[PDB]
Amino acid sequence: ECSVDIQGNDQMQFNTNAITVDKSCKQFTVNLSHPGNLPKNVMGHNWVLSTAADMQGVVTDGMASGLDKDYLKPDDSRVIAHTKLIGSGEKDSVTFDVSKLKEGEQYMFFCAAAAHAAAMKGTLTLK
Numbered sequence: 001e002c003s004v005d006i007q008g009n010d011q012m013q014f015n016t017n018a019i020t021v022d023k024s025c026k027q028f029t030v031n032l033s034h035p036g037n038l039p040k041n042v043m044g045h046n047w048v049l050s051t052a053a054d055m056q057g058v059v060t061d062g063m064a065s066g067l068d069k070d071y072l073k074p075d076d077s078r079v080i081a082h083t084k085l086i087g088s089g090e091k092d093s094v095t096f097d098v099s100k101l102k103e104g105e106q107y108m109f110f111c112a113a114a115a116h117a118a119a120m121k122g123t124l125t126l127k
């Protein structure tokens with residue numbers, strides 16, 4: 001299996017803080033869903049992948065871009081993979097090539113929604 005299921009909920013939480021990608025997968029899929037009640041503008045989430053090196057920069061410029069851009073600088077080359085921003089009752093999936101991921105590199109996933117990254121983040125690692 002070359003996928004993971006992850007939820008972002010109304011208490012500003014992902015349901016994992018460490019994802020592992022089997023390094024023999026050609027592609028890997030992240031299936032994000034929102035089990036809450038709150039509207040997208042107040043507790044909307046996305047799942048965003050970057051290097052540890054780029055995480056805060058992505059989060060900072062993302063907050064500048066704001067809700068109307070899904071809290072991501074458009075065409076940000078630092079974002080390896082991301083889902084759409086989703087609100088209550090919604091789900092989005094993103095697939096990327098495992099060849100984008102390098103050995104000897106540190107990757108972090110996080111929600112880019114304003115202020116959410118502090119709580120909503122973890123590591124992604126090939127194994």
Ligand SMILES: [Cu+2]
Pocket residue numbers: 008012043044045046111112113116120
């Ligand atoms: Cu969020």
